[PDB]
Design a protein around this motif. Structure first.
Motif, PDB file in Angstrom:
ATOM      1  N   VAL A 190       0.815  -1.236   0.000  1.00  8.63           N
ATOM      2  CA  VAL A 190       0.000   0.000   0.000  1.00  8.63           C
ATOM      3  C   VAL A 190       0.854   1.295   0.000  1.00  8.63           C
ATOM      4  CG1 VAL A 190      -1.157   1.209   1.988  1.00  8.63           C
ATOM      5  CG2 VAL A 190      -2.436  -0.323   0.550  1.00  8.63           C
ATOM      6  N   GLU A 235      -4.157  13.610   4.523  1.00  2.00           N
ATOM      7  CA  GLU A 235      -4.162  12.187   4.191  1.00  2.00           C
ATOM      8  C   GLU A 235      -3.295  11.376   5.154  1.00  2.00           C
ATOM      9  OE1 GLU A 235      -6.129  10.491   2.311  1.00  2.00           O
ATOM     10  OE2 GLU A 235      -5.155   8.550   2.073  1.00  2.00           O
ATOM     11  N   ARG A 286      -5.121  10.846   8.255  1.00  2.00           N
ATOM     12  CA  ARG A 286      -6.135   9.786   8.111  1.00  2.00           C
ATOM     13  C   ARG A 286      -5.464   8.429   8.258  1.00  2.00           C
ATOM     14  NH1 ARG A 286      -7.179  13.090   3.057  1.00  2.00           N
ATOM     15  NH2 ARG A 286      -8.870  14.438   3.759  1.00  2.00           N
ATOM     16  N   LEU A 287      -4.315   8.251   7.587  1.00  2.02           N
ATOM     17  CA  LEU A 287      -3.501   7.030   7.726  1.00  2.02           C
ATOM     18  C   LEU A 287      -3.060   6.778   9.176  1.00  2.02           C
ATOM     19  CD1 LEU A 287      -1.304   7.264   4.354  1.00  2.02           C
ATOM     20  CD2 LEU A 287      -3.588   6.126   4.784  1.00  2.02           C
ATOM     21  N   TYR A 305     -25.040  15.760  -2.641  1.00  2.00           N
ATOM     22  CA  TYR A 305     -25.721  14.450  -2.844  1.00  2.00           C
ATOM     23  C   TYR A 305     -27.022  14.640  -3.574  1.00  2.00           C
ATOM     24  CZ  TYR A 305     -22.552  12.165   0.530  1.00  2.00           C
ATOM     25  OH  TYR A 305     -21.456  11.652   1.184  1.00  2.00           O
ATOM     26  N   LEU A 334     -17.017  14.148  -2.047  1.00  2.00           N
ATOM     27  CA  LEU A 334     -15.866  13.500  -1.436  1.00  2.00           C
ATOM     28  C   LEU A 334     -14.992  14.504  -0.666  1.00  2.00           C
ATOM     29  CD1 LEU A 334     -14.226  10.633  -1.227  1.00  2.00           C
ATOM     30  CD2 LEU A 334     -12.925  11.402  -3.253  1.00  2.00           C
ATOM     31  N   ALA A 336     -17.000  15.776   2.604  1.00  2.00           N
ATOM     32  CA  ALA A 336     -17.116  14.804   3.677  1.00  2.00           C
ATOM     33  C   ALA A 336     -15.744  14.612   4.308  1.00  2.00           C
ATOM     34  CB  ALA A 336     -17.740  13.489   3.150  1.00  2.00           C
ATOM     35  N   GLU A 337     -14.668  14.619   3.507  1.00  2.00           N
ATOM     36  CA  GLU A 337     -13.304  14.507   4.066  1.00  2.00           C
ATOM     37  C   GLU A 337     -12.982  15.693   4.975  1.00  2.00           C
ATOM     38  OE1 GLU A 337     -10.761  13.790   0.616  1.00  2.00           O
ATOM     39  OE2 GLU A 337     -11.250  11.644   0.571  1.00  2.00           O
ATOM     40  N   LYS A 364     -14.984  15.631   8.355  1.00  2.00           N
ATOM     41  CA  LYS A 364     -14.296  14.689   9.236  1.00  2.00           C
ATOM     42  C   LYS A 364     -12.951  15.265   9.776  1.00  2.00           C
ATOM     43  CE  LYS A 364     -13.894  10.039  10.515  1.00  2.00           C
ATOM     44  NZ  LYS A 364     -12.431   9.741  10.191  1.00  2.00           N
ATOM     45  N   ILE A 411     -24.646   7.110  -2.135  1.00  2.00           N
ATOM     46  CA  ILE A 411     -24.325   7.938  -0.954  1.00  2.00           C
ATOM     47  C   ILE A 411     -23.398   7.215   0.031  1.00  2.00           C
ATOM     48  CG2 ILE A 411     -25.259   9.197   1.038  1.00  2.00           C
ATOM     49  CD1 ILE A 411     -27.808   9.866  -0.667  1.00  2.00           C
ATOM     50  N   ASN A 450     -19.754   6.828  -1.364  1.00  2.00           N
ATOM     51  CA  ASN A 450     -19.029   8.110  -1.315  1.00  2.00           C
ATOM     52  C   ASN A 450     -18.648   8.408   0.134  1.00  2.00           C
ATOM     53  OD1 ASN A 450     -19.267  11.401  -0.520  1.00  2.00           O
ATOM     54  ND2 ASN A 450     -18.145  10.953  -2.419  1.00  2.00           N
ATOM     55  N   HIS A 451     -19.635   8.315   1.028  1.00  2.00           N
ATOM     56  CA  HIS A 451     -19.395   8.561   2.422  1.00  2.00           C
ATOM     57  C   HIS A 451     -18.236   7.679   2.950  1.00  2.00           C
ATOM     58  CE1 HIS A 451     -20.268   9.384   6.671  1.00  2.00           C
ATOM     59  NE2 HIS A 451     -20.022   8.093   6.828  1.00  2.00           N
ATOM     60  N   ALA A 495     -15.816   6.133   1.216  1.00  2.00           N
ATOM     61  CA  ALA A 495     -14.562   6.518   0.583  1.00  2.00           C
ATOM     62  C   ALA A 495     -13.934   7.758   1.309  1.00  2.00           C
ATOM     63  CB  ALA A 495     -14.795   6.765  -0.906  1.00  2.00           C
ATOM     64  N   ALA A 496     -14.789   8.729   1.644  1.00  2.00           N
ATOM     65  CA  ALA A 496     -14.348   9.952   2.336  1.00  2.00           C
ATOM     66  C   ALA A 496     -13.813   9.688   3.753  1.00  2.00           C
ATOM     67  CB  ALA A 496     -15.488  10.939   2.404  1.00  2.00           C
ATOM     68  N   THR A 497     -14.483   8.799   4.477  1.00  2.00           N
ATOM     69  CA  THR A 497     -14.326   8.730   5.938  1.00  2.00           C
ATOM     70  C   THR A 497     -13.478   7.538   6.416  1.00  2.00           C
ATOM     71  OG1 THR A 497     -16.459   7.511   6.269  1.00  2.00           O
ATOM     72  CG2 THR A 497     -16.550  10.013   6.464  1.00  2.00           C
ATOM     73  N   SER A 533     -10.482   5.303   7.531  1.00  2.00           N
ATOM     74  CA  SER A 533      -9.238   5.791   8.119  1.00  2.00           C
ATOM     75  C   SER A 533      -8.301   4.631   8.392  1.00  2.00           C
ATOM     76  CB  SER A 533      -9.515   6.496   9.434  1.00  2.00           C
ATOM     77  OG  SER A 533      -9.967   5.533  10.370  1.00  2.00           O
ATOM     78  N   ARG A 535      -7.130   2.467   4.597  1.00  2.00           N
ATOM     79  CA  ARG A 535      -7.807   3.521   3.820  1.00  2.00           C
ATOM     80  C   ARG A 535      -7.225   3.552   2.414  1.00  2.00           C
ATOM     81  NH1 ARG A 535     -10.520   8.234   3.369  1.00  2.00           N
ATOM     82  NH2 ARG A 535      -9.703   9.820   1.941  1.00  2.00           N
ATOM     83  N   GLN A 536      -5.909   3.412   2.316  1.00  2.00           N
ATOM     84  CA  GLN A 536      -5.244   3.388   1.016  1.00  2.00           C
ATOM     85  C   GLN A 536      -5.788   2.222   0.179  1.00  2.00           C
ATOM     86  OE1 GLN A 536      -2.874   6.885   0.981  1.00  2.00           O
ATOM     87  NE2 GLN A 536      -2.964   5.342  -0.667  1.00  2.00           N
ATOM     88  N   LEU A 548      -8.994   0.627   0.920  1.00  2.00           N
ATOM     89  CA  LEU A 548     -10.439   0.573   0.882  1.00  2.00           C
ATOM     90  C   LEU A 548     -11.109   1.726   0.119  1.00  2.00           C
ATOM     91  CD1 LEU A 548     -11.077  -0.849   4.438  1.00  2.00           C
ATOM     92  CD2 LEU A 548     -11.425  -2.061   2.273  1.00  2.00           C
ATOM     93  N   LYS A 549     -10.539   2.921   0.214  1.00  2.00           N
ATOM     94  CA  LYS A 549     -11.051   4.039  -0.576  1.00  2.00           C
ATOM     95  C   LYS A 549     -11.239   3.724  -2.094  1.00  2.00           C
ATOM     96  CE  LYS A 549     -10.227   8.744  -1.954  1.00  2.00           C
ATOM     97  NZ  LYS A 549      -9.599  10.029  -1.499  1.00  2.00           N
ATOM     98  N   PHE A 590     -11.643   0.870  -3.462  1.00  2.00           N
ATOM     99  CA  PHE A 590     -12.677  -0.167  -3.502  1.00  2.00           C
ATOM    100  C   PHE A 590     -14.075   0.483  -3.441  1.00  2.00           C
ATOM    101  CE2 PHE A 590     -15.424  -3.146  -0.997  1.00  2.00           C
ATOM    102  CZ  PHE A 590     -15.675  -4.073  -2.026  1.00  2.00           C
ATOM    103  N   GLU A 609     -14.919   3.688  -3.922  1.00  2.00           N
ATOM    104  CA  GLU A 609     -15.008   4.441  -5.167  1.00  2.00           C
ATOM    105  C   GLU A 609     -15.416   3.641  -6.396  1.00  2.00           C
ATOM    106  OE1 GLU A 609     -12.864   8.480  -5.205  1.00  2.00           O
ATOM    107  OE2 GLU A 609     -14.852   7.702  -5.830  1.00  2.00           O
ATOM    108  N   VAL A 662     -14.451   0.848  10.765  1.00  2.00           N
ATOM    109  CA  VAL A 662     -14.241   0.126   9.498  1.00  2.00           C
ATOM    110  C   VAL A 662     -14.942  -1.245   9.402  1.00  2.00           C
ATOM    111  CG1 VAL A 662     -12.535  -0.291   7.736  1.00  2.00           C
ATOM    112  CG2 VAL A 662     -11.992   1.231   9.636  1.00  2.00           C
ATOM    113  N   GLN A 699      -7.168  -7.174  -0.682  1.00  2.00           N
ATOM    114  CA  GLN A 699      -7.214  -6.076  -1.644  1.00  2.00           C
ATOM    115  C   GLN A 699      -5.790  -5.724  -2.094  1.00  2.00           C
ATOM    116  OE1 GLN A 699     -11.335  -5.463  -2.346  1.00  2.00           O
ATOM    117  NE2 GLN A 699      -9.654  -4.254  -3.250  1.00  2.00           N
TER     118      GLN A 699
END
Lengths: 139, 139, 139, 139, 139, 139, 139, 139, 139, 139, 139, 139
Positions: B40, B133, B136-137, E20, E57, E60-61, E64, G24, G27-28, G30-32, G34, G38-39, G41-42, G44, G46, G83, L39
């Protein structure tokens, strides 16, 4: 860690410092080259950046794989006062990079390190390509 | 060269040293990151390399355009003993890069330098993206 | 139509005439540049064509949107007797284009026109990029 | 410079002025066309821009090659008060462009200019394509 | 969380609900638009979907990142009984989206939030582009 | 095989020998051009290689189709002692290639060979393009 | 409108509300999302957005084609506190989406609606793919 | 060759004649459609050409595979006197194509022909897509 | 409509019928060619389809432009009992297509139709290319 | 220039003549190969052209770099009376090319020429690939 | 695990062994096919590799999802002594693969497994495509 | 067939069995890897598939070229009970593959097989790359 492996790692670390130095030099030269041929030379300098980045990545990975610590301290970049000098100093940097790699090749060969010898032979071929091109530009 | 232009150039040169430092750090981190998430994190680190290269190029060009001399000496890279540290030190480096750019923006604005303000605002937006970012990581 | 909007439209129309003029100049320079560096300079001139076309389109759209009539009459193109002159006159044209846009920015800002200010700041950044490059080619 | 070559150059220069005029007209029409079919017609107008740019480049090169000076002064663009008019005036402009090229073809043929005849035949074919399409749109 | 940050988050959350809502509206309009211009308008509506997705996107980022909770509840979509109405209601939605963003810009500016101001200025420029296009389609 | 067809084949075979010669010349020039403009001229020379390869292929096919035997013996390449000479000799080679094709066109026309006339007219247009460019580089 | 067609439309409208809800949710998410993954799952999350957008478009078109009115009101999105929950709730949403589509398939089949059955079978296959993947991620 | 296989081949051959007919119709409509929406409708007609070509290829292959002889005689194309008619006749042609394929599906199913049923279901789905779109254009 | 224009339209309509016939023939041959070289010949046949489609489109457009009605009735396709025959009949079809176009060229030339002559010369060159290739395959 | 370097240059020049010869041979074979497998063999021959062009370029560059003069005189091409012969003579040419390169490798190795040895090893690998493929085609 | 699910898994595992076998067979055939048609057949064999890889992946995933263990032991590959045999044995392998999938389809259908039935129908369609093509190559 | 060639072929055949085994293992691992890092790891496993396929192809070709018969029987795949094991067993498989290739290199070198030595050195470099990466993932 044999003595030979220690000395090979010291060598790779020299190589890596020289590669970060080249990355700096080529960015610097792409930014600062002037006159009409800037349109020619900037893309040339820029292309060398990606090449050297790939060598830097390979070396730091190999250093770590052999149990060493990869340096983050680059060699000094010689200050070029004009375009001729910029090409001569890039050429000299390449010359020293190849000299070092030839030494590293006989170190790697001496330790029977097949994959590393193949890769040093390729990096030698690649840097010799660049040096020969700089000679064509200069002469 | 006004005093203000001299001080703006000193600032840009700090910025440029910090950018070469980031390029080194991110190559180093791409090479050395380990464990399953290396798959990743390596591309992530690699993507930052090209970004910072573009800032380095812009800065050295601007320095030269303003009559200064662009540095080729990078800031030190903090040594990271594990992945958490690697992400925290990249985050801190970004934080300091943005702090500097905010200062440079008020320098550029104060000298009515429109194009440079737009570009510093964009580099600020871009580095803030990266820092957010990393947060977030990390969290 | 306020007086301020009338005067902003007159300004945009000046800008648009200057943009059609630049499109003509750059086609002309791409066609006529000679000597070995023609191989360098023709693609450069050509790249500026598409850029200015995009500004011309934006301006004529904005003029119409503000209730004005977009001009189809370009400014004169200065006749260049050699390559140095071709680069100096392109540089001067860019200089005047930026001067005008800076004035238009304070007009747009004064009328609280957010989107138009952002776009003029960007066109300023873009033309300043081109002018700075021409300076590198010339010096 | 024969009399015939002088008169052929005068002709090419007319052609070139008409081509810069068309480039202006099509940008203008792309910017200003309105109503739902704007979504249709804007890309159409835009596509003609690149085409005419290529003719402008060819002509200015040929003029210079024949020892003439390429003009930078475009023909006037007729002002169109609505979409029908915009299509009719583009059609008429194409009609006049082809009429001129047919005359230039018999000039070029008369001087045994093979490459120039081939190219004028092709530009004729191309502009006739556009004119025929405008007729389909109009009828 | 200052009072100002709380109120900025409430604002962003309004913005996100509106985004949205726009994504829903544009999918709905792409699906349901009829008559020959459906061939024109469906791709137009579809292109707006991806744009608004990117704003959703970002928001929402940011919510948060500022310590808020991003909403998942969209604003209502006005029901359009024909194509004219579909374009007028999309235009009005854009108008309200820009009004909100202008307010958010003065909130962000007031809190010295550089990156967020740059991004709101850009989203303003982008939505104003769309609204101006809808006006061209409608008039 | 008429006498006219025999003489047309002899001509095509001359053309083909001249095309293999040009392919050799352009590879040779791409390899050997030196100084800073090598960066400019090498891609230029290289682009001509593919062009001439396509003519060589067309000619050998046509020769065979007309019942002849396509030669594999190229014309001599003039030895160029510097870059000016390299461009002048490429220009002269193109000049002779066009002279030959013009003769072949009147041979093909005289035998009512429609497709071959169209193709010779196109190869004439193409080589004249190259020759005119070399003139721009030289003057 | 038969009773069966009325009841099939009510069903499709449920499906459509569930699809806007999924758009919705993704998108939510993907944004949130952590932490380091996240690298992972985002992208995915999306990718699922575009998929569901295509189902939403198909359904609203089909509803309109059958004489119904497509809803613009999405189902509620369950709020995910971490998550694991984000993946479980996406999985459950997919499970319910497939349950509904299986019911719609027997409705469509019962009305001999060939094209609609093929498409529901495909949307079932597609959502089952996603659900099975979420199970792999979760277990 | 059973009686059922003979009758299935007769059916496929009807289908194939109808597909060549559609290919002709759509080329014809792409060529001849007029007015501003020609810009819209020509690409639409053109896209259907490639689709039907793929069905024609599949059918002639299947006919041959089943031991039949694929026809090369198309159905008649109805002559359309205007654009409305052009869309209505394309719609009717699609309607008849689907009616035939539904019959062929029950023939193929009755002979347990799995791959052929899957493919007829898909061609049904595809032609129903086109017919439904034509209805949207018409209403 | 002169007598000459009437007779030119009759000719174009013959050409168009022959083009639809070729499109049918090549699809048919792509579907039905057998043995190991099917892997070779199917893509060849397929490539000719798109070519002839472009001629069909040009002709029907030109017919309409000249005031005629474009036919939708193709010429018969000769039935080929094996691969040799398939190649000989494609070759003969091309031969007849070129014969017709040569006649149409002297019709178009006689009416001073520049664009149409250029296009017929090109279609002649193109079909002669195909015929010559078929001869190479056959011999 | 040592005696060994002189003899290595003579060798490279032999290699270069053989490479220009191969480029001629492969163009010739692409043009002239006949029968159904022409569709197979022409692209094969064509692919070898670009390969050999790259070797020709490398060799002429290396010759110049070592202080020699690169030849422009190709070896003779053996005349092939049919396809079998065409493949056997291409195979024999490759065999001789590899024999020469093996000799050049021991020359380069003997002079410690690292980059040149790597490149000759690669050209050997590449030509052996081609020769082995020709053997598969022949047997 | 019902008895039916156990027996369905045993079936899928047979399918998977047959798919790994096909992947081996097609690599083997791509490597070893000889004579001029090798140029034709190698890419054909190669294309089947990727197809079967996708089936292997789907099956092993489904087996795991149903609670089984996916095998890693392929079926035997029949040894082919020449090209005819190579095509006949690939055809027979496809025939057996389809026979198995048809059985698996009635197993999946019997357990109401919608997504799995759709996918088996598609894999059946796909393998039948390949088998029918092999028949064309063979006959 | 010398004794040495016989023993080299036995070796290559071992290599080939190990390569088919790796292709199976990596497909199996791509299908079955679970948890969030699936993933990450699935694309990694998938990328190795294509790599090993290329080695399998090279080896079977070389075996045949040397007069041997390429095996179609893979080595056993070790069964992995979890992700750690999956990575350790892939690493061990790579380790054994490199050990074998090193032995094959000294066999090939001993028989003066230049192209084969170059290729084994490259496959060694490539597999060592993969093994070193697996070590990074594991540690």
């Amino acid at each position: 860690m044999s003595h030979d492996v220690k000395e090979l790692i010291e060598g790779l670390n020299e190589d890596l410092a020289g590669e970060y130095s080249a990355i700096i030099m080529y960015n610097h030269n792409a930014a600062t080259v002037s006159g009409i041929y800037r349109q020619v030379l900037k893309p040339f300098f820029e292309s060398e950046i990606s090449d050297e980045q790939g060598h830097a990545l390979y070396l730091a990975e190999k250093i770590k794989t052999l149990g060493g610590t990869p340096t983050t301290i680059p060699l000094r970049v010689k200050q070029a006062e004009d375009v001729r000098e910029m090409l001569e100093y890039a050429r000299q940097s390449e010359y020293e990079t190849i000299k070092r790699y030839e030494k590293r090749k006989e170190q790697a060969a001496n330790l029977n390190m097949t994959e590393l010898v193949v890769k040093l032979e390729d990096m030698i071929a690649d840097e010799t390509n660049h040096m020969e091109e700089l000679d064509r530009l200069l002469n």
